[PDB]
Write a protein that binds this DNA or RNA. Structure first.
Length: 70
DNA sequence: AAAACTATGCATGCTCTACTGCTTCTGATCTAGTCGACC
């Protein structure tokens, strides 16, 4: 039940962010994914266990996709 | 010496106050099921 955390449970809630759509009266929804990913590193400094940024890896072949799936 | 008045004990009924047993109401507990929302 991440849907409803229990107080006695040892595990806690974590937020893995993979997009930003607005920062300081600047609308990022019409921008490219590259620029939003770049901006996402200038909003918060992640602290493991509570808030994090999902890692994206560059790839330009099908074999890379298959290796990641495996 | 005989008769009338009064005292005390006892029977009698009725009324009132504790104790035991049956029935019903409430509280507490457990078990089973439903719903919100996600995925």
């Amino acid at each position: 039940d991440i849907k409803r955390m229990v107080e006695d449970s040892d595990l806690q809630t974590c937020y893995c962010v993979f997009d930003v759509l607005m920062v300081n009266n600047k609308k990022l929804g019409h921008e490219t994914l590259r620029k939003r990913y770049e901006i996402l590193s200038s909003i918060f400094t992640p602290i493991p266990g509570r808030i994090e940024i999902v890692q994206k890896t560059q790839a330009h072949t099908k074999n890379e996709v298959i290796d990641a799936l495996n």
